[PDB]
Every structure is written in structure tokens, then in C-alpha cells.
Amino acid sequence: ADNKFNKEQQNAFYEILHLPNLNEEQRNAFIXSLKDDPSQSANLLAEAKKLNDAQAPK
């Protein structure tokens, strides 16, 4: 776990991948913005986790 991105970007990557409430292809807008601009990774992470929270099973 290193030869992909930097610490923040990669941690964000796996955190977004860890999000089970997020739509496969929401996850894959985030992951595929992560890999256009890997400087938005923190924002993408925050939004993704937020949306994962919002999309929690009801």
C-alpha cells in the first residue's frame, strides 16, 4: 500500500472504496476525479464519506 498514490490520496482512495453505501459508479466519479486531479482527493473523500452517510440503508 504505497505504489499507488501519496498517503492522503491513497488513504482517501481506500476509504472511498471502504464506503458500502456509496453507489458503485458515485464511488467510481470520485475514484475516476481522484485519478483527473489527485489534489481533490481530500475533498472527494469528505464528500464521498458524507454521501455514504447520506445513502445509509433505510
Side-chain angles (χ1 to χ4, degrees), residues 1-24 26-27 29-58:
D2 178 79
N3 60 277
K4 292 186 174 183
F5 301 95
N6 205 332
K7 288 177 175 60
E8 183 174 288
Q9 286 65 30
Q10 188 181 269
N11 194 146
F13 180 94
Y14 286 121
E15 270 294 278
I16 300 176
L17 253 296
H18 188 91
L19 303 176
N21 302 332
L22 206 66
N23 289 25
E24 188 62 79
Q26 190 69 269
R27 177 188 297 141
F30 281 113
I31 298 298
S33 186
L34 211 168
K35 239 125 131 57
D36 190 281
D37 192 293
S39 188
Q40 298 177 29
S41 310
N43 168 267
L44 302 177
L45 176 60
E47 286 299 276
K49 295 179 71 65
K50 178 191 296 173
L51 303 185
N52 178 86
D53 183 66
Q55 298 175 31
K58 299 176 185 59

